Design a protein around this ligand. Sequence first.
Ligand SMILES: Cc1nc(-c2ccc(C(F)(F)F)cc2)sc1C(=O)N[C@@H](Cc1ccc(O)cc1)C(=O)O
Ligand code: NA
Lengths: 187, 188
Amino acid sequence: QYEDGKQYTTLEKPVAGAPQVLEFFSFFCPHCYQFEEVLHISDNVKKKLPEGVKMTKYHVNFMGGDLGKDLTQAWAVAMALGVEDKVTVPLFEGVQKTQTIRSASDIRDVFINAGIKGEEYDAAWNSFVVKSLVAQQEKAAADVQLRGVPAMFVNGKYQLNPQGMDTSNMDVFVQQYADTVKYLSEK
Amino acid sequence: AQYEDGKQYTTLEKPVAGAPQVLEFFSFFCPHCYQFEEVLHISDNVKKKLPEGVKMTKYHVNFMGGDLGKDLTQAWAVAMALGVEDKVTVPLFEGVQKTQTIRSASDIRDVFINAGIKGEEYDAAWNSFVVKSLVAQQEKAAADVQLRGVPAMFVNGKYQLNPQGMDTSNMDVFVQQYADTVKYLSEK
Ligand SMILES: Cc1nc(-c2ccc(C(F)(F)F)cc2)sc1C(=O)N[C@@H](Cc1ccc(O)cc1)C(=O)O
Ligand code: NA
């Protein structure tokens, strides 16, 4: 029983050439921590979607002050090096659980400890490839008039509405969320 | 340590009458709350340094958890009603955050049963007026201190701990600084 306003909302001005599935998060975002560590939303959405569908995940600037911008640049590094899955957990825990991530250096340490060579990290950090990925993340958020995280957009036309879903059972919530993404992608 | 308003603690503009002597707020969904309790043992270390007669109170809140969050607050009310907080705190934190075995109210109940509380006793407590009242008490206390987030601790409804705020460069030092601050405030 899908209804606009319930499981999802519809953007007023759809974004052209938008990614099929686009997620925004912040490492400072508490629901984003839950979505990644506890619920594994991205993994479960991926499992429910066809192989052909591309999922994109971008970091945002508007949580966490100066460190917030640094983390967006760090996420650009992770995308450029293809090590998202190596650093997502220690970045989330470093920010929200242990609160040991306080500076860019602390972010660098996380990449080092996750097996990324220091020289490779620094080269990426300062690269124009990464500068462009930072620009891409910012523009994407601006295109959908992003006001908060977590957020997921389907074909630049629909936005998921987790608030409209059932939150008594974690796996029911995940099922309803993932099923909504599939429904919207086939729309 | 040299204590100053605004440093190790802040002072509520609207103090709360009849508040518990030492009141801690947490959520089982809250990862820094997991850090506080399961890793740092803040509650326990504060209690060790508390003066004789001063009891600790700990309430559950629901900023992140939706309906399941409400179930957790009611289950925490049951833990308080039964006096089994020290038996279920660990498996609730680990079950929600680490093993991800706690996904519904039924899984919460299973934790109490595995910790030695009979199912019929858990259910009796769950549906009791005592637990209904305790749920309301936890909410009201959070409202009274204008709670913004967790973890948080309040002393005599007048002072709010400010860990920000403290030497969080060494976890052992942080814990003693935090516990010493609670002792100081309780003595004022
Ligand atoms: C993004 C988000 N995700 C949530 C969620 C997801 C899963 C689960 C479960 F445990 F079941 F897995 C619980 C909550 S609330 C939530 C969220 O946006 N929460 C709001 C408050 C709110 C909560 C429930 C409503 O029906 C309406 C408003 C806030 O934090 O201010
Ligand atoms: Na605190």
